[PDB]
């Protein structure tokens, strides 16, 4: 019998993982602060990594990679991509992004020398501002920086993708969410089922603060949007519908047109940070489920916009995905008494 502990009750995915583990008849849940566990399902903040791997008689595994936050918080990721030679400033799949601190190191004296060469060359010059609610999509700098300094947090400003791929019927934006599981052996597993988080407003290239055609977030779409639910149930189109639409409207598949780039981007990011976070020779072991957020443009080029270190699955998929987490992240380490993942390796 194996023992585990739960320290994040607000996690949908690992709530389901706890249920599955208990139903195995070979996993028992201890109280949150009992140290004699095999598996810690940790808290999201200040998880006590320094206390794992010091229990004699116990192999200990945890559902977070210490240090993965460098990929999963926006300014962390901008600094990682620009400073890592593996990724490089000359990185063809991450939008032009600058880390800017509030009025109250910083890149706005770097950001102007590029922005104004965008205005002089008579290129489109829309930028979006965000932090790890509070979004500004504008066309000139003094709206962006102004706004950033009204807030109090470190921020990034990213080149807004003005020419996105638009789904018809609708002329509406969407983002792709890919769930990736990294096991203790640092196999990278891309889950077969991604999701499209769609808009229901026709992209308005004119005034960028109708923030309902421009912002794919599952919440801003349900509340303030006109037609939440007209085209797809929950502004959630899945992969077979998308492949079929790509085949019909565009005469391509999802695999060739988008997925190759998504696998390349996921593998590149994770391999970039592998020596910093790998637990290969550590006294405890880590796994983690990441959610990757992508945007396809009109030329069918995939862009990465964020990595989330504690994602929520799509309701249709919770069962199969959490069962997969058990099968390859947990039972690989703690064996019990046609896979749903693609291994990314090259």
């Amino acid at each position: 019998m194996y023992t585990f502990v739960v320290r994040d009750e607000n996690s949908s995915v690992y709530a389901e993982v706890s249920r599955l583990l208990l139903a195995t008849g070979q996993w028992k849940r201890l109280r949150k602060d009992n140290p004699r566990f095999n598996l810690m399902l940790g808290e999201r903040n200040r998880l006590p990594f320094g206390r794992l791997g010091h229990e004699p008689g116990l192999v200990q595994l945890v559902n977070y990679y210490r240090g993965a936050d460098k990929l999963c918080r926006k300014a962390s990721l901008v600094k990682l991509i620009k400073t890592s030679p593996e990724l490089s400033e000359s990185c063809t799949w991450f939008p032009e992004s600058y880390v800017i601190y509030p009025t109250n190191t910083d890149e706005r004296e770097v950001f102007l020398a590029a922005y104004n060469r965008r205005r002089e060359g008579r290129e489109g010059n829309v930028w979006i501002a965000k932090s790890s609610e509070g979004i500004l999509i504008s066309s000139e700098a003094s709206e962006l920086l102004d706004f950033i300094d009204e807030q109090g947090q470190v921020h990034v400003i990213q080149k807004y993708l003005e020419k996105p791929l638009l789904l018809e019927p609708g002329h509406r934006k969407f983002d792709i969410r890919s769930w990736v599981l990294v096991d203790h052996l640092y196999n990278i597993y891309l889950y077969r089922e991604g999701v499209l988080r769609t808009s229901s407003e026709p992209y308005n290239s004119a005034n960028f603060q109708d923030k309902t055609c421009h912002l794919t977030n599952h919440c801003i779409q349900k509340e303030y949007s006109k037609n939440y639910g007209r085209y797809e149930e929950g502004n959630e189109m899945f992969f077979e519908e998308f492949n079929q639409y790509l085949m019909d409207a565009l005469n391509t598949t999802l695999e060739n047109s988008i997925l190759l780039q998504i696998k390349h981007i996921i593998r590149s990011c994770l391999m970039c940070i592998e020596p910093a976070i790998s637990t290969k020779h550590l006294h405890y072991q880590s796994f983690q489920l990441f959610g990757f957020d992508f945007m396809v443009d009109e030329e069918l080029k995939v862009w990465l916009i964020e990595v989330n270190g504690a994602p929520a699955c799509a309701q249709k998929l919770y069962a199969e995905l959490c069962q997969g987490i058990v099968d390859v992240a947990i039972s690989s380490v703690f064996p019990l008494a046609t896979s749903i993942f693609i291994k990314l390796h090259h």
């Binding site: 201890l30 009992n34 008689g57 116990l58």
Partner: protein
Amino acid sequence: REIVHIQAGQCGNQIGAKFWEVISDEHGIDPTGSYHGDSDLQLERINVYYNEATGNKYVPRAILVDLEPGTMDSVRSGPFGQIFRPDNFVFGQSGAGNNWAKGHYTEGAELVDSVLDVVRKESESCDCLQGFQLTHSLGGGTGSGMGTLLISKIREEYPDRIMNTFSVMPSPKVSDTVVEPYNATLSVHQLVENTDETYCIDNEALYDICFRTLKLTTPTYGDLNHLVSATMSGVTTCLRFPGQLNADLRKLAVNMVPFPRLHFFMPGFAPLTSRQYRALTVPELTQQMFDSKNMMAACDPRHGRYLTVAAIFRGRMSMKEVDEQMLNVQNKNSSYFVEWIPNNVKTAVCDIPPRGLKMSATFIGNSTAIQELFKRISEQFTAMFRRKAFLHWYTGEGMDEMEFTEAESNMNDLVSEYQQYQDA
């Protein structure tokens, strides 16, 4: 270094004599006090319990006390009865009539100073006295009443020495008189205040072990005492033999007792032996030593939590396997160990096995389930006391009903203290 052993009253002397027989055999010492074993490990720490008398003869550092001469005449006549220093036999004539008051306040009071004189002569002849042990019952009058009087006098005169008891608790299934709940409640009050450790030996438990698993159909006091002396040998073997642990009294006391009053221990022995042979594996030993049925206090460990545990292994076995099985016990039943005392289970090994066994184990648990024992006594006590039944045996020796009310309250207090830490 030296330990001073005291045994008081009938039960105290019968179990104390069996203790001295068992460990004299283990150290190769015959009923005349002469050494006759092979190993020198038998003599390296012999002075912990024996004084070296002229002729390299070994005399137990043991004081024998009773208010009637019977049982001590029986021990002088017994198997090892001539091993004891004759001056160390201290007795009165009139007996205690199963009456705590006689043991503590009247007859006992008249004998106690002569007992302390022998204690003092034994102590001042010690280079480095670490403390005392007392064997007695709590249900009679001499062991309970005079033994606790002795305990308080010894504390007064030696406040910085360790004081341990091996205390037989009374049970109605193995019962001499109806007043045992009174004598035990009065005694437990003393013990909670003036001992460092008390090994709670429930006579019900010894009976059940003799009957259920030793298949003894009608257990005698002898049968019960064989269990007790094997257990006591177990719990003292680390003091008596060289090993990687320079085992002493104080460090067990410090490490087992997180709160001064919660020092009542549930002892156990494995494999449980009669007066059979299939050898035991280390996992088997380890499961049995934690088995409720090998414990000498009739408390369910699953009804409480372990505050601390000493696990003592005897014989030659793999330390790696011992460590694995001990960790498996704690990791597969971690609920029952309090999390606010990290790593509260410690392991000791003595290479020399007891008589007739290649491997054995001894268990010493400080568990909150021991509250059960005190609840039993308390219920028995209250059923008589609410009608003041049998009190005249005590008021005739000068005691007041108020002292009964106080001892009752104090034992209920001790029960509550254990309950506090069972839910903490």
